[PDB]
Design a protein around this ligand. Sequence first.
Ligand code: BT5
Ligand code: BT5
Lengths: 235, 235
Amino acid sequence: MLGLKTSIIGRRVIYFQEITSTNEFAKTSYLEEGTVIVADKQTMGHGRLNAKWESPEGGLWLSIVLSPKVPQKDLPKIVFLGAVGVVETLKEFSIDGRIKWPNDVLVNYKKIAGVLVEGKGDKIVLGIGLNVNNKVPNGATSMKLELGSEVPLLSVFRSLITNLDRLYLNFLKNPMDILNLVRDNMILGVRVKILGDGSFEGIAEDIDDFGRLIIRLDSGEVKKVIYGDVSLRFL
Amino acid sequence: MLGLKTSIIGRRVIYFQEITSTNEFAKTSYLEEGTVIVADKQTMGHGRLNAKWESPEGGLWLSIVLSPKVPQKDLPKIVFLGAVGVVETLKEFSIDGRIKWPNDVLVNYKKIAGVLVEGKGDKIVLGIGLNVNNKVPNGATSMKLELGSEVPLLSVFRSLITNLDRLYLNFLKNPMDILNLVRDNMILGVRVKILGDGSFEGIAEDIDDFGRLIIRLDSGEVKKVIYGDVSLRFL
Ligand SMILES: Nc1ncnc2c1ncn2[C@@H]1O[C@H](COP(=O)(O)OC(=O)CCCC[C@@H]2SC[C@@H]3NC(=O)N[C@@H]32)[C@@H](O)[C@H]1O
Ligand SMILES: Nc1ncnc2c1ncn2[C@@H]1O[C@H](COP(=O)(O)OC(=O)CCCC[C@@H]2SC[C@@H]3NC(=O)N[C@@H]32)[C@@H](O)[C@H]1O
């Protein structure tokens, strides 16, 4: 009854009033490619690592099942499809989102959405959490707070799924296209610090052909940061 | 993202752009009580004895998984929950739906919806096919045809699910209540022909405490019809 017109993403949608985590469900359940798992609320929503993802009523919490018949090397760009999809949807709603490498979307440096890509067996689960009308953690923002009005959650869902289906279908044919879209929509030319063992600081110059963040240290040294269990701070 | 506020029916919803049959998927798959299976169109939709059910885009084709906590003698009344739910939804849209015992809903004697209940142990599948904006076969009608304007399919879905959840929860508490609602919304006082092993005609007087149709033959003989493989025809 939703009448979705997409080719792959959205062929099937499993909606939950409440769920632990859409990503967890998508990983442990057999689902055909393109299946979207979405819930009004998550009781165990999580981000990267062991970070909790606040998922109250009013937000858009979903996961998409994929298994791209593309080179192994291109897999790490799936996260970017999610981020760019969110950016495109936000633009449709008069909001300018900027990508904070590698999986966050900020609006005036306030986090409005986060992407989490995982894999079980050989299916890839693309998780996206976007704040719409829900309450958000301190420092974060939402479509409602940015527009100062209640936004129809289903309208945002339809928009995002439409953008993702297009981005994904193109990715399957031209896997390098997403990189330039990210470059034109990400925060660059600013100083950042990479936390953890062997931490260092420098200017985030760009992302390379593999999506690695290129940082220029003050000494002139150039380091390439892979995205995974990485922690980045804007200085 | 749907924000359904029902207690049982609609806890989860599995949407399909296309499916063979929501009833077949529901019967076959491992699903929890309250899960709704819905599709834009069905390629192999069916009624009783595998009769063909036209399921083009524009209509509401869904099935609900139930596991009623009521005596076995009450199970046969589940079809009425579907028929009444449809009538209540139609009334919300100012359409005069009337029940044709025991699974059809008519508007000016044209079939606008059909209900099909299938069981197998602890699982009962309640299937409902309602013509909304789709083209229909001769003998049938739709919400769009009766109102003269298209109706938002999702609005019909939300209405029906809300009504069914309420009716179902009350059915668990008071299994006899549904019978009163059927009596008040069913076509009675007219002559009908019962088709099965042979056939007979008489006035459809009412339904008894088991949901059996009570027919008064011209001779004054009273017959009680059980819903198995009997078709009712209006003269
Ligand atoms: N609702 C929210 N809005 C903005 N920031 C939030 C937030 N909830 C938590 N945070 C902060 O963001 C951090 C998480 O950042 P990360 O970069 O690691 O991780 C992320 O940014 C990814 C989030 C992915 C969420 C979706 S919801 C659908 C699907 N199902 C799931 O269980 N997950 C995915 C936390 O440590 C918090 O400090
Ligand atoms: N779209 C339509 N609208 C009105 N009448 C129709 C129709 N398509 C077929 N018919 C007529 O209705 C008769 C079927 O009557 P019955 O009393 O046996 O059977 C019914 O009236 C039950 C129909 C149940 C349909 C739903 S759709 C969701 C779920 N998935 C399924 O596969 N089925 C259920 C056919 O023999 C046709 O003459």
